[PDB]
């Protein structure tokens, strides 16, 4: 399991989280441990075979029993108890204290899910990937999630005015490059924030039932935005296909912050003339962007349309049934399109 | 015996949480059976028999016992003591411990309440309905209600912006479906809210009396702002009548967060076409919402107006004497109506 | 299953002791059975199966689990854990404490031993014949010995004095039933004073290792006496035969201090006129008694003289030479046995 899986798996109203809150509240210690390895047995000593069901209270019982509990990988079925988990004093390990001493290095030993949880404190622990991670109250996370809420809708503010700028200008386009990629500098920022407030509530699971609301209310469409603005705007002679607009956005989330606040960098990302000069170069928009506006529309006929045209400047100074007569179009339905681009102008 | 019922017989201020909190500083277990009829007559056995009237003295001094203390059905006498509580062993249970498994199927066997106080430690478990539910202490729960009520605000004032942009283009009548949509979708969104909040502050008692202050003066007029606007918006001859609008409120309340953040679904609810074309009609305010602002207003008065008008822009475009004409309306109560109508014009 | 075999398995130095010092010492519970059946497992429910062999730790660990712990009827095997161990509600048990009464009622089921241990406390339950007995600490044990030990004492020179007196009318001709009887009677009640306190040497097991070698130097060889007694003061017209004389000596051990203290009973058990006269009679010895004390003797050719000769008169008229004339006895060992008499003479 990987971290922001392990995660998941504590996260609050799964089996597991469960019994660690009846430990929790049971003011005992408890060393979990997750997974059935030939290494996990030939650390384990000392103790038990039980091979019954999983319960809450399976753990409860076998953690109050003043030892470390083993599990299946799955987290199902118990077939170990109080055993001693001994790894070889050569691993390093600054943690002060036997139980976590022992669940550091069995997680660097094994890449497992071990939880050390210690009495007289609520303190729940995981030592997986070379790190450990103290499982927070969930005040702490509710308040920091709501801290960058604030922060992640000033972004959409920011992103919706710009995006709507940069639109009503291109209806009677000349493009800038600080003005093509100031979009695309905000429209990253949104979603690295999106993906951060996505690794919190994920941390979070189910008492947090509201930050997905949020998310899902606010955001709404980023990286089906980030999708039409490459496939738009990419200054390259071939017209950019899927895969080549996957690199791009790989690409972008390679680049830093610092890397992503200088317009050269995102320049040379698109493939643009990386010289200061180039600031007040223009192209014409290819047509993704503000046709993608019409509703009931398939990817396929934009990309069709595209290859028919080319450009959206054409597309605005184009007829009526021009557009028909682009093989697989009616008269009618392209009827649809001219309407509405042309109330697209205003 | 609902789970949200017994746990506000449980809150702080109430007689039976004065005893619990009495036995918890007592540092002994408890395992107090509120209630006494055939069932539990039938399943407990070899104690004392006492028919004495409730006080938090004595049961704290009967939990001492070491048995089961068994209250009556209202928690207002003290009837049985030690007695054993032989379960039926064929009920299946998962809690392990011979105390928590005895309580757990009692439950089972008959509904009631069965509070397991654990011996020398400060939990109090709760056993209706099938349900196990730890009772917190009151700072997790005034936590929990302060980050959401925090969430409250948001949404309501998300709500008044979206209520007043609502009014403002009812008063010039246009309006979209969407428009229409983006008022009830964050009603209903507030409603749930309200709803989660109140089930805290009712689990607080007496503890949280600021919660309910804040929730009251947050939340204000929201069922009425609710039926006011489902009898104004609903796509059929005649405006629904109160049952009818009743059960349309039911029908809002099955619905789900996966068919609450839809608005084809949403409109559909009313009866609505689902096509986006639909999603882009227009339909004129009945005028409830919006003339229900004239104060001290009959409701009665206010639907017979509106059936005589039928829309909110008849309203403003009536005369002096066109209100004075209707049934029911005199001299005084016409001009009355149309003081607030012509102020709200500007 | 007997009490004084379980006890001595709990006596300290056996496994089950010192693991039940183990749980004390924790001050924590403990519910341990030794002994598994159809009825066992019917009782049986929510408990766990390890089939690990018995070691001193187990019992303590297992006991944190607040069931009960299920070991083989052997007390080596250990095959369950935690188990709520609820027997039929219908049984009789006056024990009030849920635990207890579980263990008293399986106990009475099967009959094997329930060890319970009620936790903050160092007090030790056997539940073993259906009849509780606490463990007692060893201190007041060795009390109640030492106090038996000095009456024992006083006892054994009461017997001596009179069986020395008996000793001088032997040397005599002078034979009494009473003197002959009331040696005897001492001597049985002398016989189950130390059964008396060999219990109490069996219940301490290790701890007590003095009182058994107290009661070996002060008891002596009372079955011997017994034996030869018996053998002896036999007034019937053949000797006795081994089946008879322990037959006999069930006989005797039958009867209750209440009809040992009379001498006619004792005399009337064995056989002989009721008569207060008879107290007064004489009776011929076989001598076993008045030549026992001969060194390197052995017990059938004592017999085979007995019954050659028929009387103690034969043996104090025998001659130099009558001795020899006896089949299946040389000379050598002749004067052997006569210089014996001689010797007691004076």
Redesign the interface.
């Given at each position: 399991p990987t971290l922001r899986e392990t995660l998941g798996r504590l996260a609050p109203g799964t089996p597991l989280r469960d019994g660690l809150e009846r430990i929790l509240?049971?003011?005992t210690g408890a060393l979990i441990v997750l997974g059935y390895d030939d290494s996990v047995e030939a650390i384990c000593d000392g103790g038990?075979?039980?091979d019954?069901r999983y319960?809450?209270?399976?753990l409860?019982?076998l953690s109050?029993?003043?030892?470390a509990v083993v599990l299946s990988s799955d987290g199902s079925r118990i077939l170990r108890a109080?055993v001693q988990l001994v790894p070889d004093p050569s691993i390093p390990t600054d943690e002060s204290g036997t139980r976590h001493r022992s669940a550091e290095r069995t997680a660097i030993q094994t890449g497992y899910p071990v939880i050390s949880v210690s009495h007289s404190m609520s303190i729940v622990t995981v030592y997986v990937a070379g790190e450990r991670h103290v499982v927070p109250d969930?005040?702490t996370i509710?308040?920091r999630a709501?801290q960058t809420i604030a922060t992640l809708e000033r972004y959409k503010g920011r992103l919706d005015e710009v995006s709507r700028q940069l639109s009503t200008a291109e209806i009677e386009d000349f493009v800038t490059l600080r003005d093509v990629m100031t979009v695309v500098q905000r429209l990253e920022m949104v979603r690295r924030i999106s993906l951060e407030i996505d690794a919190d509530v994920v941390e979070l699971g189910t008492?947090g039932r509201?930050l997905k609301?949020q998310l899902?209310?606010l955001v709404g469409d980023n990286e089906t935005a980030r999708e039409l603005i490459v496939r738009d705007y990419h200054a390259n002679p071939d017209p950019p296909t899927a895969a080549q607009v996957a690199a791009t956005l790989e690409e972008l989330d390679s680049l830093s912050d610092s890397e992503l606040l200088d317009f050269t960098v995102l320049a040379r990302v698109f493939g643009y003339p990386s010289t200061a000069e180039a600031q007040d170069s223009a192209m014409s928009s290819r047509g993704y962007r503000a046709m993608a506006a019409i509703?009931?529309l398939q990817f396929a006929h934009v990309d069709l349309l595209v290859r028919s045209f080319g450009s959206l400047q054409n597309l605005l100074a184009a007829s009526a049934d021009d557009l028909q007569s682009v093989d697989g179009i009616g008269s009618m339905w392209a009827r649809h399109i001219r309407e509405g681009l042309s109330l697209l102008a205003e």
């Open positions: 509240r049971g003011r038990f075979v039980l019954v319960a809450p209270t399976r409860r019982e109050k029993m003043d030892g109080n969930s005040a509710l308040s709501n008492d509201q609301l899902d209310e509703p009931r």
